[PDB]
Motif scaffolding. Structure first.
Motif: not given
Lengths: 250, 215, 239, 228, 201, 213, 238, 204, 240
Positions: E58-61, E75-81, E100-101, E110-112
């Motif tokens: 659902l995140l990839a959508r 961005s990687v920060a926006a995707a994990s948020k 993990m993202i 990026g590694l969250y």
């Protein structure tokens, strides 16, 4: 059902809209209120309309409404529409105080009401409010302030404004007699009785025909005082004493 | 239904050559008490299908009301169409499953017999929504007692005449009278054929007590 | 719930309530904006002061963020509610994607707010146009405008309000590359442009510059008096 | 005097659906050509002012990696239909793990196109072209404000529609190539537009079976102009 | 279940095992626990296998819709948020998720780390799973920021091998990815029984 | 009180081939210690190239089958083609997750052909996670069947054994033998063995008897 | 005329004009002809196009395995009822596990379309459904109308220039209840050549045929498989 | 319990033409003080106070909802509120949360504005008003405060002896409580002036 | 004018024309008569053959509301079967709540209030249908009611709706329905609808009859074929 609708919200083909301009035409007649400030204090001078000899003269004022603990408003126009707006921004100031535990700044009380008033001009299929009104008050960010609202929903800060029946006659005389920041609250009282001497066609300035309220800052009080009908007429004749001297000596 | 107040008991059913026969008793128990001793637990749906039920009896009168309306309003359309027995079996399965899903079930277990278009139909419906078909059915303690007597005949002889089936039911109703504390010696037999639905009266069994003289 | 179609088609394919609203824009005061390569400069004209009012409550240049300013024309009642909805959206972007709002993103929010509002039931369209000016991340100064039908649209120089055709016809004969040479030289383009409009002889103009790293900075009417002197002084000697 | 928005003509069609067909004769012209090698698809920009930034406007926009679009008529309400088409292709990818075909994108938008009324307010005044390559090869569709879509082979939409459709029926055949279908469309746009043709008045975008949706830019575009 | 990820000079290394059990019964040995969100993002599977599979699909959508509207990648920060906010709406209802993202960004690697409880933290090294504590011990010994590429492959490969050796719910094969500048590249997939003969002698 | 679940038993088995897919199941329906029927298969034909098996709570297996068969029609009326096997597995993962907080008690294995005529096996959990495998066994006797097919199909734990791919003929007798061993030690494994074979030409069926305890 | 604006307002003669104007919309669409034998139901449509390069607008749709429809009118309203039509067939198949009868389907359509013909600010559905299907009672040919008044019939024709097609069917309907599928279809194809101008008729790209059959699932034939049916017709006599 | 989570004690006592109110100063969480200046007595106009004791959230929450409803009352009407009227106002406010109740127990003390007559009352956590003529108490250490006031109260007391009685009633009862203390503030009101004193108590 | 657009406006002499305009739509539907005998009710509908293409048994103007209640309509057919749905639905809620079959004085009361509710508002129009209701009970006898588009209901010994209404109920009072059983009635129902609608206006027409009473055991159903062929044998004896 769509045959009986009056369409109070659409534009006119010339660009403007008719429905609030008819309301701002009705705000021209029926009342006279004015305010002035230059120093410590700010005053509202209002002219009473119903001067019939059978009335009780109660409720502490007629067109002056205490809104907050440290600000008040004078109103003009349709009086029935006035009572609904007054007890609407009266609890806007309280739900601010409930939320922040601090008295409301005088400017963002005006913007809160003028968003409610703007919405009826914009959707809903509804008659707008035919009410324009002044605002005096005090806050710790800018001190003594003076505002004016319109039925369209736009406001503005001022130093002297009238919304009377001859308001345009008064404003042309206010910007002939003034001083920025030096009119203390005795010269302002002297200038107030001079202006409504002119715009009131009923001559001689009966002391029961006007109302004057002042807002002076005492240390933790912000005293809002509606001055009684025993010190009006001495201020009336004080205008009348100097005008006989100023005419004869010229 | 959270708790069944007035309940029924086992219902039998078996196919034969051109029709289905169903029998059940005429008792509504209440805990261990036999309060209502003349109720009827078999409903005759229109002409080629037929319903009996166990479990809570007040819920059975509800489905007797709802199915009664779904047949009346269809036949006054004049379509020339009626519900097949497996169409009712499909409807009643969805009614059970859509109601346990709201965690408020109908405390019943139902057997649907029917004879339409030359062939017999016999269907099971559970409270939870479990449904299947079989040449012989039994609910309650009848699944433990009468159901083994049904299968051992049908595996040695797949088809039965009408007189063989009606004899074979009355033997199984006798067994449930001996070895079940919630039975009663007054039952009725319902039978579909190509001719229609016939419900016989309050029949009774013949018991044997010759072993009671054995000390 | 007032359910009535306000904006409908004409028999020749126009939306009358939309183009009636474009005439409400055509009598608001003039707002002009150009962009330099390092400092943007936009400034309204026709302040129309009456010397008895608070000068700050009448402002039409406001900020949506640190990097995004906004000017408008039309009727001021509908303006300051579009602004207050835009301040909420550019703030909720920061709770999402961490960078500040790009200047292109906030105009797509305003124009899409303004379009669907000419589509709903029982709502007259907005009667304002806007100029959104901002220097985004990586220091690219650019500006946009918003038609009341909701078409966001970028520019190099623009002018809306009363008397906008004459000013735009003035800028096309005047916007050279060397006019944006110096920061004090791009301002001499704007003050020459608004003087070629409704009069505003140093008393009715209010420029507001932004040097791509500061906030907005209103110059008081002393440098405008200093700039209007030298803008006339070059015209005094050449002709 | 005032009808509703939902009233039939005595001739029987409607009023405001037929009025919206008149509204798309004011937009910029647009030409798309389906060729078995791939779909080429072009438009003009109608630049008004020299001070205007030219690349800020666009008419070609993509829906997915394999589906492009082209709009005419009004523009501000076209952005609503584009966003519904983007979400629809992602819900199809989410649940079925494949790419939605070009035809079934179009009817998902066309079902939205006629839903105005006085419950739950006017038809959309746009006209769209859909170029894409699904598993049946390259496709080209054209919807309407009325919600009617049909597969075309070479459709011209805009203010110069019937002038271009006459000149497009004489140059098309079923065995074109994509390199000459691009050149054939720019000859038609050169005749119908106001200003002279350069690398800024127009833009193109093609979709091939091999690569994804590709849009030309101001470096690889003007070789076709100088070799017109 | 054992996953780990650490970032260094040349991108981010992601590794995981492949055993999925059911009580004491092993369901499968070939479960791909590092799912591929994009050509430029990676996500792991830890805890509920179906909950990590759904919400990261659902995140990839959602990241694809962001790219079409804004015309650059998220961005990687926006995707994990986004993932932290979707899961929070079902807090207390019993979701199991410890993913993990990973991914390259405009600010570098990026590694969250995102939990089902609402934890969203940055970091340089992480290890999630039932045998995660076995992975931390060997990874902290051989970690350096200035590792070579072939050296960092051997660190993450042997670190999974020690975790499957002690933990009973970890095993299978060792999948191994590498996030680079342009995008992630699949490195290898080694069986543990082949690594046992390799790492012994 | 009223418990909404029960265990009805059942055992399904699928093997992906090079150009085929074999799906088999028993035909016994039973809960508690009793027997409901000796004829109730689990081979459900979705298309001509996809067969699904459903084991677990039987009331959910009846419902889930009818939900799927509706949505295969809604795809065709909206896309003018049938679903592929991989599209069904991605769809049913969303259906099972849609009742995340009141789940189906169903174990699902989808066998069928892909677009290239190769076998494909997708095994599901009751929540909706999946992967593609060569062989899976689900249901009650899944702990008995899975170790045997690691030895024979997977060629695991053996030395010096050549790796020939499974033919159709070898895979038939491999399935028939592994249920005979499962019927001895499991009380739930039934009486007739319905075997459905999906090839490039259609679906064949075959019924093999077992012991009837 | 003030009586001609809304669906609610009656005329002083008693004829609501907004219903009568929706009958003009079905007279604008191209013609289609349905007819039935004892054991079969055949409907034949006539496509149109805009240019010679655009494709032809299809009209025959597949509702269920035993129900197909044919449309005439504006196509966006046709898909609004077709999606209602598919939905009401498969939920009855979900509940009762049986095909929904044809005569009971159309009574749902007549109740569906009557509601906007009585409210305020609601248009009628301008569409012209011909319905062919199977009950247990054999074939059925039904037509509907925007006035929500459905008709049972044995042969009808609706669309632009359909009166000439009805005159052909009245003088040949004694033969329809006997013939097999071969000349049942080319009876109906002789109706569509009646409703055309005198130069072009049936060039295998503007015609579509649908058959539901006693052992035959409902099947749509398009522009290549039409050619076995379309051959064997005589020339137009002139 | 819930009332013993933060502690607290409020006492009011009626005099001749005067009325005094007192409360503790401790704010704490179950064993541990945090600060010793927590306000529990709030002004409601001149010559009319209210004391709150119980859960420290609802002390600060109810005292803001009550002030919200009070300012709207005194602006819609042109007068100050009577002491009896406020008792009906608070009892409405608590009873609306009949099943979500605020964990506090108010004590109201003040003079009637026209005829200067004292008034005291107390309410439970769902609003059962109880007017008395001698004293009301509320808080955790209630039973200690009844032994003081039943033995020390006199009917007609000047404001000097009224202060000495309510001081000795609080300093001995709160000293026997564990979760109440750390200082005592005493308000004593009358028709001419108003007096706030803080006592020298055990900080132990 | 302007006083006759909505149904919410009275005229300046005090009547609603939207109801009277909707009544005028009834006199374009053909003819539906129904008389009740000593022990039952017999309906009768003469049915126009519009074209040869329609099927014998199409578009029946004679419905079946409950097991014992019948309906014959005359008006705008889409509104007729819309009223037939709510009347069929109203009788279901009576049985599900009160347990027994609905009586006619209550059933025609509930439907007529639903018809009356559309003659009050501007948002809806009045129905364009008039219809009849007839039934038989063993505890009540036969009943016969009729409902106009305004919402007024009464009882009848025999009524008629359609084009020729007065020309039909002229001959009804020539009969003696107080004593005749519902066998001789069926020949007399068909005869009085043969003398109406001359062959100038219509080419051919169709007889459609209905039938209820204890001879039908309380159930409502159509007549058999042989009985209505006797009435069509009783057709061409009205030429003397």
């Amino acid at each position: 059902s769509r045959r009986y609708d009056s369409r109070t919200t659409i534009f006119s083909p010339e660009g403007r809209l008719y429905q609030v301009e008819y309301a701002m035409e009705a705000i021209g007649h029926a009342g006279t209120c004015l305010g002035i400030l230059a120093n410590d204090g700010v005053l509202l001078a209002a002219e009473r309309r119903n001067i019939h000899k059978l009335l009780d003269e109660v409720f502490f004022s007629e067109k002056i409404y205490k809104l907050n603990e440290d600000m008040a408003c004078s109103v003009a126009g349709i009086t029935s529409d006035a009572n609904v707006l007054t007890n609407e921004l009266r609890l806007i100031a309280q739900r601010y105080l409930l939320q922040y535990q601090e008295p409301i700044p005088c400017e963002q009380l005006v913007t809160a009401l003028c968003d409610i008033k703007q919405a009826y001009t914009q959707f809903g299929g509804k008659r707008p409010f035919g009410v324009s009104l002044l605002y005096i008050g005090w806050d710790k960010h800018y001190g003594f302030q003076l505002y004016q609202s319109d039925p369209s929903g736009n406001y503005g800060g001022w130093k002297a404004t009238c919304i009377g029946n001859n308001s345009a006659a008064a404003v042309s005389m206010l910007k002939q007699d003034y001083k920025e920041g030096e009119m203390t609250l005795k010269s302002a009282l002297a200038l107030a009785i001079k202006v409504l001497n002119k715009t009131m066609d009923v001559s001689k300035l009966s002391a029961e025909k006007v109302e004057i309220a002042t807002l002076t800052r005492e240390n933790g009080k912000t005293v809002i005082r509606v001055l009684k009908q025993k010190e009006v007429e001495q201020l009336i004749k004080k205008h009348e004493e100097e005008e006989a001297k100023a005419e004869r000596e010229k | 239904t959270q708790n069944p107040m007035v309940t029924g008991t086992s219902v039998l059913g078996v196919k034969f050559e051109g029709g289905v026969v169903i029998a059940a008793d005429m008792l509504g128990s209440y805990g261990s008490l036999a309060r209502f001793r003349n109720i009827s637990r078999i409903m005759r749906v229109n002409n080629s299908t037929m319903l009996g039920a166990s479990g809570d009896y007040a819920d059975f009168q509800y489905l007797k009301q709802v199915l009664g309306q779904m047949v009346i309003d269809e036949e006054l359309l004049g379509d020339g169409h009626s519900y097949s027995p497996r169409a009712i079996h499909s409807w009643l399965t969805r009614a059970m499953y859509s109601r346990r899903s709201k965690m408020n079930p109908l405390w019943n277990t139902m057997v649907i017999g029917g004879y339409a278009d030359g062939e017999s139909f016999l269907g099971y419906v559970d409270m939870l929504g479990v449904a299947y078909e079989a040449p012989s059915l039994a609910t309650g303690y009848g699944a433990y007692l009468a159901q083994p007597l049904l299968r051992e005949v049908l595996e040695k002889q797949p088809v039965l005449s009408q007189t063989e089936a009606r004899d074979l039911v009355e033997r199984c109703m006798r067994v449930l009278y001996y070895r079940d504390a919630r039975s009663y010696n007054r039952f009725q037999i319902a039978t579909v054929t190509e001719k229609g639905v016939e419900i016989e009266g309050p029949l009774s069994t013949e018991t044997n007590w010759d072993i009671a003289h054995m000390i | 719930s007032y359910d009535r179609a306000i904006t409908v088609f004409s028999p020749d394919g126009h939306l009358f309530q939309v183009e009636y609203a474009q005439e409400a824009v055509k009598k608001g005061s003039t707002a002009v904006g150009v962009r330099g390569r390092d400092i943007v400069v936009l400034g309204v004209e026709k302040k129309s002061v009456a010397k008895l009012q608070d000068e700050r409550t009448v402002r039409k240049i406001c900020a949506l963020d640190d990097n995004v300013c906004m000017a408008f024309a039309g009727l001021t009642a509908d303006a300051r509610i579009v602004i207050n909805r835009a301040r909420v959206e550019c703030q909720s972007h920061r709770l999402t994607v961490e960078d500040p709002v790009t200047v292109e993103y906030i105009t797509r929010y305003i124009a899409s707010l303004k379009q669907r509002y000419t589509q709903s039931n029982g709502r007259r369209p907005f009667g304002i146009s806007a100029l959104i000016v901002g220097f985004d991340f990586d220091g690219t100064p650019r500006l946009y405008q918003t038609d009341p039908s909701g078409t966001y649209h970028a520019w190099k120089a623009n002018a809306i309000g009363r008397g906008a055709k004459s000013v735009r016809e003035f800028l096309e004969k005047n916007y050279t590359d060397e006019a944006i040479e110096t920061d004090d030289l791009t301002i001499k383009l704007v003050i020459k442009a608004l003087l070629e409009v409704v009069q505003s002889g140093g008393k009715n103009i209010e420029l507001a510059v932004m040097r791509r790293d500061q906030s907005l900075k209103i110059l008081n009417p002393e440098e405008i008096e200093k700039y209007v002197a030298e803008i006339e002084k070059e015209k005094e000697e050449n002709e | 005097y005032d009808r509703g928005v939902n009233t039939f003509s005595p001739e029987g069609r409607l009023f405001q659906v037929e009025y919206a067909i008149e509204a798309i004769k004011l937009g910029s012209t647009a030409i798309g050509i389906q060729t078995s090698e791939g779909v080429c698809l072009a438009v003009e920009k109608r630049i008004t002012s020299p001070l205007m930034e030219p690349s800020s406007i666009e008419k070609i926009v993509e829906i997915d990696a394999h589906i492009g679009c082209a709009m005419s008529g009004l523009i501000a309400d076209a952005k609503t239909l584009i966003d519904k088409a983007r979400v629809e292709t992602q819900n199809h990818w989410f649940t079925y793990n494949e790419t939605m075909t070009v035809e079934s994108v179009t009817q998902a938008v066309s079902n939205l196109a006629l839903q105005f009324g006085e419950e739950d307010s006017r038809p959309f005044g746009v006209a769209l072209l859909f170029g894409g390559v699904d598993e049946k090869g390259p496709q080209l569709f054209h919807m309407d404000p009325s919600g009617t879509f049909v597969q075309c082979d070479a459709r011209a939409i805009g203010s110069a529609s019937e002038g271009a459709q006459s000149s497009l029926q004489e140059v098309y055949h079923k065995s074109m190539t994509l390199k000459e279908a691009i050149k054939s469309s720019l000859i038609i746009l050169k005749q119908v537009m106001e200003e002279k043709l350069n690398a800024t008045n127009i833009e193109l975008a093609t979709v091939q079976p091999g690569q994804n949706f590709h849009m030309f830019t101001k470096e690889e575009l003007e070789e076709v102009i100088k070799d017109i | 279940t054992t996953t780990l990820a650490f970032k260094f000079r040349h991108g981010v290394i992601v590794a995981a095992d492949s055993r999925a059990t059911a009580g004491a019964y092993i369901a499968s040995q070939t479960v791909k626990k590092v799912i591929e969100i994009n050509p430029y993002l990676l996500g792991t599977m830890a805890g509920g296998a179906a909950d990590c599979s759904f919400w990261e699909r659902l995140l990839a959508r959602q990241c694809r819709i962001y790219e079409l509207r804004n015309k650059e990648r998220i961005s990687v920060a926006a995707a994990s948020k986004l993932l932290a906010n979707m899961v929070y709406q079902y807090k207390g209802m019993g979701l199991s998720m410890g993913t993990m993202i990973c991914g390259w960004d405009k600010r570098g690697p990026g590694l969250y780390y995102v939990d089902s409880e609402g934890n969203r933290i940055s970091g340089a090294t992480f290890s999630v799973g039932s045998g995660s504590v076995y992975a931390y011990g060997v990874m902290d010994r051989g970690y350096s920021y200035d590792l070579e590429v072939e050296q960092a492959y051997d660190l993450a490969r042997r670190a999974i091998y020690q975790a499957t050796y002690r933990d009973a719910y970890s095993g299978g094969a060792v999948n191994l990815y590498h996030v680079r500048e342009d995008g992630w590249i699949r490195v290898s997939s080694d069986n543990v029984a082949d690594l046992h003969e390799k790492y012994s002698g | 009180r009223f418990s909404p679940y029960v265990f009805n038993g059942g055992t399904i088995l699928a093997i992906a081939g090079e150009d085929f897919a074999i799906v088999a199941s028993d035909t016994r329906l039973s809960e508690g210690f009793s027997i409901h029927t000796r004829d109730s298969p689990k081979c459900y034909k979705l298309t001509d190239k996809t067969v699904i098996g459903c084991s677990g709570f039987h009331g959910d297996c009846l419902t889930l089958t009818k939900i799927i068969e509706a949505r295969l029609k809604m795809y065709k009326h909206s896309n003018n083609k049938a679903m592929t096997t991989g599209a069904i597995a991605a769809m049913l993962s969303t259906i099972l997750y849609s009742r995340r907080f009141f789940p189906y008690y169903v174990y699902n294995i989808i066998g069928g052909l892909d677009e290239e005529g190769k076998g494909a096996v997708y095994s599901f959990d009751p929540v909706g996670s999946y992967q593609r495998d060569s062989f899976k066994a689900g249901g009650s006797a899944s702990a008995m069947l899975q170790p045997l097919l690691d030895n024979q199909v997977g060629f695991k734990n053996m030395q010096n054994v050549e790796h020939v791919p499974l033919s159709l003929d070898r895979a038939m007798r491999l399935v028939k033998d592994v249920f005979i061993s499962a019927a001895e030690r499991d009380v739930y494994t039934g009486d007739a063995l319905r075997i459905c074979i999906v090839t490039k030409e259609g679906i064949r069926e075959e019924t093999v008897s077992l012991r009837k305890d | 005329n003030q009586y001609d604006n809304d669906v609610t307002v009656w005329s002083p003669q008693g004829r609501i004009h907004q219903i009568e104007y929706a009958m003009e919309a079905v007279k604008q669409g191209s013609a289609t002809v349905g007819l039935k034998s004892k054991t079969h139901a055949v409907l034949v449509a006539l496509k149109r196009a805009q240019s010679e390069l655009a494709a032809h607008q299809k009209k025959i749709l597949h509702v269920d395995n035993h129900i197909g429809i044919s449309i005439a009118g504006l196509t966006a309203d046709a898909r609004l009822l077709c999606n209602f039509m598919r939905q009401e067939c498969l939920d009855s198949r979900f509940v009762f596990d049986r095909p929904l009868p044809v005569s009971r389907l159309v009574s749902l359509i007549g109740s569906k379309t009557q509601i906007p013909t009585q409210r305020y600010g609601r248009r009628p559905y301008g569409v012209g459904l011909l319905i062919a299907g199977y009950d247990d009672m054999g074939p059925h040919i039904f037509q509907t109308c925007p006035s929500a008044n459905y008709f049972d019939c044995r042969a009808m024709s609706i669309g632009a220039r359909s009166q000439s097609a009805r005159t052909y069917l009245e003088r040949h309907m004694s033969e329809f209840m006997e013939c097999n599928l071969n000349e049942l279809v080319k009876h109906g194809l002789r109706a569509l050549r009646e409703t055309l101008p005198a130069e072009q008729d049936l060039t295998t790209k503007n015609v579509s045929i649908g058959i539901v059959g006693k052992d035959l699932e409902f099947t749509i034939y398009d522009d290549d498989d039409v050619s076995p049916f379309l051959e064997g017709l005589e020339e137009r006599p002139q | 319990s819930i009332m013993s989570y933060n502690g607290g004690a409020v006492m009011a006592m009626k005099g001749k033409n005067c009325v005094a109110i007192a409360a503790d100063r401790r704010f704490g969480i179950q064993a541990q003080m945090v600060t010793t200046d927590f306000q529990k007595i709030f002004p409601m106009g001149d010559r009319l106070y209210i004391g709150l004791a119980g859960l420290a959230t609802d002390v600060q929450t109810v005292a803001q909802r009550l002030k919200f409803r009070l300012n709207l009352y005194e602006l819609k009407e042109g007068r100050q509120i009577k002491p009896y009227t406020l008792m009906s106002m608070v009892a409405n406010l608590l009873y609306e949360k009949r099943f979500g109740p605020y964990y506090t127990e108010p004590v109201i003390a003040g003079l009637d504005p026209k005829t200067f007559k004292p008034f005291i009352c107390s309410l439970d956590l769902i609003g059962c008003p109880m007017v008395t003529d001698d004293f009301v108490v509320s808080g955790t250490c209630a039973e200690q405060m009844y032994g003081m006031c039943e033995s020390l109260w006199e009917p007609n007391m000047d404001p000097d002896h009224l202060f000495e009685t309510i001081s000795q009633a609080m300093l001995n009862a709160v000293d026997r409580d564990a979760v109440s203390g750390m200082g005592v503030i005493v308000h004593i009101i009358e028709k001419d002036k108003i007096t706030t004193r803080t006592l020298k108590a055990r900080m132990d | 004018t302007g006083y006759d657009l909505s149904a919410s406006t009275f005229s300046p002499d005090g009547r609603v024309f939207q109801v009277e305009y909707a009544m005028k739509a009834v006199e374009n539907s053909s003819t539906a008569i129904g008389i009740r005998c000593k022990d039952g009710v017999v309906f009768g509908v003469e049915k126009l053959v519009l074209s040869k293409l329609y099927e014998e048994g199409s578009n029946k103007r004679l419905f079946n509301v409950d097991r014992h209640v019948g309906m014959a309509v005359a008006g705008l057919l889409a509104d007729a079967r819309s009223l037939a749905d709510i009347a069929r639905e109203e009788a279901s809620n009576f049985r599900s709540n009160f347990g027994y079959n609905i009586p006619l004085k209550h059933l025609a009361d509930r439907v007529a209030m639903y018809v009356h509710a559309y003659t009050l508002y501007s948002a809806v129009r009045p129905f364009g249908c008039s219809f009849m209701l007839g039934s038989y009970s063993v505890n009540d006898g036969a009943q016969l009611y009729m409902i106009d588009p305004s919402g007024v209901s009464y009882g009848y010994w025999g009524c008629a709706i359609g084009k020729a209404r007065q020309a039909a109920k002229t001959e009804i009072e020539k009969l003696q329905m107080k004593e005749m059983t519902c066998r001789d009635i069926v020949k007399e129902v068909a005869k009085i609808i043969y003398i109406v609608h001359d062959e100038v206006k219509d080419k051919a027409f169709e007889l459609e009859l209905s039938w209820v009473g204890e001879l039908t055991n309380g159930r409502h159903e159509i007549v058999p074929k042989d009985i209505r062929e006797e009435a069509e044998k009783y057709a061409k004896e009205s030429l003397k």
